[PDB]
Each structure stands twice: as C-alpha cells, then as structure tokens.
C-alpha cells in the first residue's frame, strides 16, 4: 500500500464522501464492529505541505452493531457557517440508521425498520438527499424518506446485492440481484425500465462509471464484467478478476477506464486488483490480510480498502 493508517478495530466497510463537503480534505467514513468513524484525509498529491497522508478523526458514532454498508448524503457539508454531516448505515440487525451531526454537540440518529432479511447495500437516491434506497436478502429493494417511512418497494427475484443511483439521469435506480440480473427502476413511475444479465453467478457488486454513464461494471463469480448501454444487454467485456470469488467492484471517480475489484474474505489474503480496460492483466495487485469495503477518492487516482485495524491506500500511476 502507498499509505497505511492505523484504526482502533477491524474495518468492515469504508466509503469516501463522493460529494463536495467544502473542505480542503476528503471526508472518509469507515465502519467497525460497533462504531462508525468519520475522518478527514489529506494527501501529499493534493497539498505539497502534507508529508504522505494527514489522517484526522473528526467524529466517532457508537453504532452497537457490525456495519455492513455506509451511504453519504449529498447534503453533507463541513462549511463553518452551517456544518452538516449526514450519512446512512446498514447493520447486521437488518436496520438502517440515519446519522445527523453538526460536528459539535448535536448528534442524532434515526432507526428505520422493515427489512425482514440482511441489508446488503444502501444509497441516497435523490439529488436533494431526502430518499434512501436499500437492498437485501428479503428479496426487496425499498425506498425510504428520512422520516423512516417506506415510499416504495420493488420485489426482486433473488437477494439484492448492490444498489446505485444514476449519476446524471433523474429517477434511475440500479439494482444488482445475486442471480446475475441488473435491473433499472424509475422512482417516478415505480417501474422497471430495463435489465442486464451476467454470464457468471453469483453477481456480488455493481457500480456506475461516473465519467461515462453508459458504462456499468460488476463482479460475478470470479470475473469482472462491463456493459456499455444502450448498445447491448450482453457484456462488452468479461475477464478474470480473482482466482477465488470476486466480492466488490468500484469504478474510479477520475478515470473511466480504471476500476478496482476485491476478492472474497477467506483463508487466502484478500487481494485487491486494479484494472485498466486497455490492459489484459491488472495494472496493480495489492494484498490486504482480511479487508472489507472498497472506495475511490473523488479527485485522486487513489483507492482505499479496510483491513484488520488498518486502512490501506493505493495510488495508481495514470
């Protein structure tokens, strides 16, 4: 790893804030066994006054449960006039928790109940940050307001494994199902618009390319899979990602040809593989002893993976 930061406990999930918070540093959230930490990261590649990585814990939230997914709210700002931290979490208790903070003394959380199975993924699904989409082992995709009222529910054919909001198009939710189907839902009409099918199963994670909204990447079985819309429902590319089960797929936020994949946590060291579409092999192979969560920095060609009491950062040479 280019950089390494020590953590109090095991990192189960890690997510960079994909939004602009108005600070010079990039916000990072990571979930432990019973807590969520919010930190600021500054890198030597952004500021020549930083030697390597400046990592500052801003806030720690007691969760009481193992965090499985974290979603940032678009309303999240660190501006001194009206600081507002908002994020959602899913945990092993099948509940969603929305956290709100002013980075001072006001720390509130709301519990949302209604999933009957484990929640596998969640996102904010509105530009205004009012709505949360969640997917789980109850074979539902559910839409919630910040009041914890269910606005909508889509019945899935298998466990929902990943959910993502479309970066430019209003009302388009992507839902990846474990059996290899990726569906798109319109949240205005409450209808499925389209599906894609993976050649391999189980489908474990899918992400939108923010730089090219026609591209979707995923991991299914051992392979990474790319689709280009609207050209075909069939994959454009399908290549090996890992020797034993791929787990997470995330697109780089700065490059439309770069993405990271993670292997399944197990008896082998979890490998991170960074791929470039022009290359038949990974451009970088990292090892994390046991790691969960994968996120990309908003501006830098830098990705983070959580591990045993550590965050590991890889810079990719562009």
């Amino acid at each position: 790893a280019t950089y390494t930061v020590d953590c109090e406990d095991y990192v189960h999930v890690v997510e960079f804030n994909p939004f602009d918070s108005g600070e010079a540093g990039s916000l990072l959230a990571y979930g432990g066994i019973s807590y969520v930490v919010i930190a600021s990261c500054r890198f030597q590649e952004e500021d020549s006054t930083v030697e390597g990585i400046e990592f500052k814990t801003l806030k720690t939230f007691h969760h009481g449960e193992r965090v499985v997914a974290i979603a940032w709210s678009p309303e999240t700002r660190c501006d001194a006039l009206l600081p507002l931290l908002r994020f959602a979490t899913a945990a092993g208790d099948k509940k969603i928790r929305i956290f709100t903070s002013d980075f001072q003394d006001k720390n509130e959380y709301k519990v949302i109940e209604g999933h009957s199975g484990y929640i596998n993924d969640l996102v904010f699904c509105s530009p205004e940050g009012t709505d949360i989409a969640s997917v789980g082992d109850d074979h539902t995709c559910r839409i919630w307001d910040l009041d914890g009222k269910q606005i909508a529910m889509f019945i899935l054919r298998s466990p929902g494994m990943s959910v993502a909001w479309h970066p430019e198009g209003a009302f388009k939710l992507m839902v990846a199902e474990k059996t290899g189907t990726i569906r798109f839902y319109d949240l205005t009409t409450h209808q499925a618009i389209l599906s894609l099918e993976s050649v391999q199963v189980p489908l474990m994670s899918a992400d939108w390319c923010v730089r090219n909204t026609l591209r979707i990447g995923a991991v299914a079985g051992n392979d990474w899979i790319i689709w280009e819309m609207p050209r075909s429902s069939y994959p454009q590319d399908n290549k090996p990602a890992h020797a034993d089960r791929a787990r997470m797929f995330r697109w780089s936020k700065c490059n439309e040809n770069v993405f990271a994949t993670t292997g399944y946590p197990g008896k082998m060291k979890s490998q991170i593989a960074i791929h470039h579409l022009a290359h038949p092999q990974p451009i970088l192979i990292g090892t994390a002893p046991v790691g969960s969560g994968l996120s990309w920095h908003r501006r830098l060609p830098l990705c983070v993976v959580g591990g045993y009491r550590k965050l590991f950062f890889w810079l990719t040479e562009m």
Binding site: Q44, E45, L300, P301, M318
Partner: protein, 57 residues
C-alpha cells in the same frame, strides 16, 4: 540546471514578435528540439513534469 528556462527558449523561438523560427535551418531546429528534450528528461529525473511544474498524483 535551469532546465525550466531551457524550455522557455521554445516560446522565444516560436514568438511572432521576433520571428526567430524563420532564421533557423531544418537541421538547427531538429538539434534545438533534441536539446530541449534532453533538458525535459532532466526535469523528470527531478520529479517535476516535462515542463518543470508541480506534479499532483
């Protein structure tokens, strides 16, 4: 070791104010570009960009 100022000679030679590019032969212009490339390689060895500016990863 003023390698950044070596590259500014390209801006001076290409300047329409003095039209210095009109007095160079094709062989001299090739030799100038080779010498500018040599100074640009020395900037890369100093961990600067090919033009002598700050590099951000």
């Amino acid at each position: 070791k003023q390698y950044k100022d070596c590259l500014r000679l390209a801006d001076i030679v290409s300047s329409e104010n003095q039209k210095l590019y009109t007095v160079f032969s094709k062989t001299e212009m090739r030799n100038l570009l080779q010498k500018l490339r040599e100074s640009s390689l020395m900037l890369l060895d100093l961990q600067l960009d090919p033009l002598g500016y700050e590099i951000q990863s």
